[PDB]
Design a protein around this ligand. Structure first.
Ligand code: CL
Ligand code: CL
Lengths: 109, 109
């Protein structure tokens, strides 16, 4: 076989997509598409998070803060153990990657 | 200040861009744009690598393998301590993120 491992993420999605693609000892990488009016579950981050926004606008509410908007061209860091909500209110299509390191299991102890 | 930390990456770049944006205890995230005919330095990966390709086509040569081509919509894993070369031969503009975890310093011991 090859040295590398390949994953594919959906291009030009126009529907809600939650792709939990990479899940290794060292990292998790997900690909998310949220059409306008959709949102992800409210939850506390289970690792250190970076949100790589490649299309549209995200409305991110953390803890007791007012909602903050981030557009394509932003990478947003959310610390471990922080209450978060991701919504797409303001764009036709919001597309981002979620990078988590280390794997949540490493922080569960 | 805010709970989150924000970074910006260059959108719609048409020139060579090597943006070493995120560099934390836990992760590194870079944003790279290679116009046609450009390439990155040949080197051995200093952590576990994932290449998130969002535009164009990458020609990736690992160790003694023939060059392999990967297009937009691929995430490519390259293990730690592997000789690699990234080239853009076949597309006008190749754009990818590089996710590295854990931080290289953690593997340097
Ligand atoms: Cl990994
Ligand atoms: Cl981090």
């Amino acid at each position: 076989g090859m040295i590398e491992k390949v994953y594919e993420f959906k291009r030009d999605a126009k529907t809600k997509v939650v792709e939990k693609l990479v899940n290794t000892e060292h990292v998790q990488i997900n690909h998310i598409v949220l059409p306008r009016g959709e949102q992800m579950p409210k939850h506390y981050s289970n690792s250190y998070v970076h949100l790589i926004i490649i299309k549209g606008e995200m409305t991110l509410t953390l803890e007791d803060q007012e909602p903050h908007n981030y557009k394509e061209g932003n990478i947003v860091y959310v610390p471990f153990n922080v209450k978060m909500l991701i919504q797409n209110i303001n764009s036709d299509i919001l597309e981002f990657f979620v990078v988590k390191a280390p794997h949540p299991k490493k922080l569960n102890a």
